[PDB]
Amino acid sequence: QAIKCVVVGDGAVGKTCLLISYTTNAFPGEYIPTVFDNYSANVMVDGKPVNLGLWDTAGLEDYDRLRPLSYPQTDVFLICFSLVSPASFENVRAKWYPEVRHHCPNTPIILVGTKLDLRDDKDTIEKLKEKKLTPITYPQGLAMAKEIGAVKYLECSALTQRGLKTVFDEAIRAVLC
C-alpha cells in the first residue's frame, strides 16, 4: 500500500537529518547530501508490505509559497521542533499547526521532538542558559500535541537513532489505524 508522509517544522530543527538517518542510516553530515530530495522506504508493519513515501520541506519563510504544493494527497504529517530550541517549539502552534490544517483539515498529525540528545549535554546546556532559556520538557510537547490533536507524540535523535524507527512505525499505524 502507498502512504504519503510529509515532514514539516521550523527550519534548522533536523527534518532532513531525520529522513536520511532513518532511510540510509547515516547522519546528513559529511557534506550535506542532495538538496530538496525526497525519500521513501519499504517496511514490514505486522506481516504487511508498506511502501512509505517521505516528503521533505523547507522551513524558511521564503519557501512558504511552494510548500503547500507537496501537501495534496497526504496521509500523515510530522510537525517537528528542536528540544534544544525553545523558539522553534513555540512556532509549532504559531506557524505549522495552522498551515498544515489550512490545507488539509482532516489529516492525522504527529508531533516530534528532534534532537533529544542536545538536551542533556554540557554546552548548549549553558549557552541555552546564557540566553535565559531552557530545553523542552516532556510536558508541553506532550501538551502541545494535545493542545493540537496530534494522534501521537514522540521524541528522537537522528544522531543516536534512538526513537527514530518508532516515529515512522507510528505514522503508518496512524494511517491504516
Binding site: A2, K4, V35, F36, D37, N38, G53, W55, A58, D62, Y63, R65, L66, L69, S70, P72, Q73
Partner: protein, 180 residues
C-alpha cells in the same frame, strides 16, 4: 464440467488488466509529483544564488541576472503544473481505489458463487455414480449484479479519464506556452 459465462469473464479479465495498468500510471504520477517538487525548489534556490552572484559580481552582473530571472520564472510556472498533476493523481486514485474496487468487490462475490455452484453439481454426479438417482440462484443473481456494475463502471471510466487526460495534457502544454 466448469461453468463459463464467456462474455462476462472476458470483461472481468479486461477490467483486472485495466486496473493493473491504471495503478501503474498512478505510481508514475506520484513519482512525477515528487520529482517535480524537488526540481521546483532547486530552481528557487538557484534563482537566489544567481541573483546574489549577480550583485556581488559586476563583471558578470548581466549574465547571472539573466539566469536568475529565468530560474525564478520557471519556478513560478512550475507551481501551476505541480498543482495540475496533484489533481490528475488524486482523480485517478479515486477511480481505481474506490469506483473500480466497488465493482471488483462484486466480481469476487460472483466468482465465489460460480465456483461453489460448480462444486455442488460435481458433488451431485459423484453421488449419482453410486446407489443411483438420475432424475444456482445465488450464482445467477450475483451474475446479473456484476453485469450491471461493469456497464456503469465502464461509462464512468470513459468520462473521468477523458477529462483527466484532457486537462493533464493541457497543463503539460501550458507549462511551455506561458513559459515561452
Amino acid at each position: 464440467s466448469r461453468t463459463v459465462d464467456l462474455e462476462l469473464e472476458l470483461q472481468i479479465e479486461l477490467l483486472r488488466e485495466t486496473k493493473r495498468k491504471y495503478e501503474s500510471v498512478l505510481q508514475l504520477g506520484r513519482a512525477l509529483t515528487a520529482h517535480l517538487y524537488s526540481l521546483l525548489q532547486t530552481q528557487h534556490a538557484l534563482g537566489d544564488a544567481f541573483a546574489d552572484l549577480s550583485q556581488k559580481s559586476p563583471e558578470l552582473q548581466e549574465e547571472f541576472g539573466y539566469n536568475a530571472e529565468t530560474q525564478k520564472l520557471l519556478c513560478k510556472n512550475g507551481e501551476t503544473l505541480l498543482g495540475a498533476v496533484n489533481f490528475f493523481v488524486s482523480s485517478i486514485n479515486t477511480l481505481v481505489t474506490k469506483t473500480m474496487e466497488d465493482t471488483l468487490m462484486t466480481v469476487k462475490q460472483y466468482e465465489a458463487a460460480r465456483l461453489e455452484y460448480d462444486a455442488y453439481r460435481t458433488d451431485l454426479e459423484e453421488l449419482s455414480l453410486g446407489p443411483r438417482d438420475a432424475g444456482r440462484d445465488k450464482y445467477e443473481k450475483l451474475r446479473g449484479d456484476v453485469a450491471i456494475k461493469l456497464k456503469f463502471l465502464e461509462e464512468n471510466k470513459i468520462k473521468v479519464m477523458h477529462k483527466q487526460l484532457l486537462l493533464f495534457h493541457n497543463a503539460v502544454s501550458a507549462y511551455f506556452a506561458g513559459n515561452q
